[PDB]
């Protein structure tokens, strides 16, 4: 899908072993499959169906997403930062697209 711009908010460093809050947003219509067009016909589903956040290649959270997640899906969760490197955020579209964002994080 077009214009699936990710936005992530997460501190850029942490003390080793500290928790950080991660907030991850992407722009997406998330057409649910329940909306009817002007002629009363259902409009086919097309959503982001999965979101992952990995820290230094290890999973923080893996979310299976269904049509009841809102337009512009938003996820917030907490990562333990034991060592420097990077977060990788991935969103999987029903249409086959894969959206990614990478954010560095340093330690102390």
């Amino acid at each position: 899908a077009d214009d699936a711009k990710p936005r992530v908010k997460v501190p850029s460093s942490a003390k080793a072993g500290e928790t950080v809050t991660v907030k991850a947003l992407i722009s997406h219509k998330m057409e649910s499959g329940q909306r009817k067009d002007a002629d009363g016909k259902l409009i086919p589903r097309s959503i982001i169906n999965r979101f992952t956040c990995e820290l230094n290649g290890v999973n923080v959270v893996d979310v299976a997403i269904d049509p009841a997640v809102s337009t512009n899906p938003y996820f917030e969760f907490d990562a333990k930062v034991d060592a420097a490197g990077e977060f990788k955020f991935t969103w999987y579209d029903d249409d086959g697209s894969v959206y990614e964002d990478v954010k560095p994080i340093a330690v102390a």
Partner: protein, 112 residues
């Protein structure tokens, strides 16, 4: 035949019962706009938390699977609710046991 909520719940529990306690489900008493309702779940120790919306045409909302790099087992998102209904959170622990929390959200504008 069982309800869809019951079917999803049974798949998650492996047929065992749901217990109570061990999790928090936070949702507004009244959601002005059912297109976007903030929900937070917390379940210390959970390997996964599944969210259901029992009055939605397709009740499954999302399943959060916590990996090794999660600091704790909190997640927040925003969801759609078609009308006033109960929202259900199920949390599964490392031993396979499941706990349940449920709360009613009143909805003004429908979100499906």
């Amino acid at each position: 035949g069982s309800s869809t909520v019951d079917e999803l719940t049974a798949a998650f529990t492996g047929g065992a019962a749901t217990g109570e306690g061990g999790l928090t489900l936070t949702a507004p008493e009244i959601a002005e706009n059912g297109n976007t309702v903030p929900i937070e779940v917390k379940a210390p120790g959970a390997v996964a938390i599944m969210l259901l919306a029992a009055g939605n045409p397709e009740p499954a909302v999302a399943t959060f699977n916590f990996g090794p790099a999660a600091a704790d087992q909190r997640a927040a998102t925003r969801i759609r609710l078609a009308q006033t209904q109960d929202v259900i959170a199920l949390a599964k622990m490392a031993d396979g046991s499941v706990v349940k929390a449920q709360t009613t959200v009143k909805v003004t504008i429908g979100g499906c």
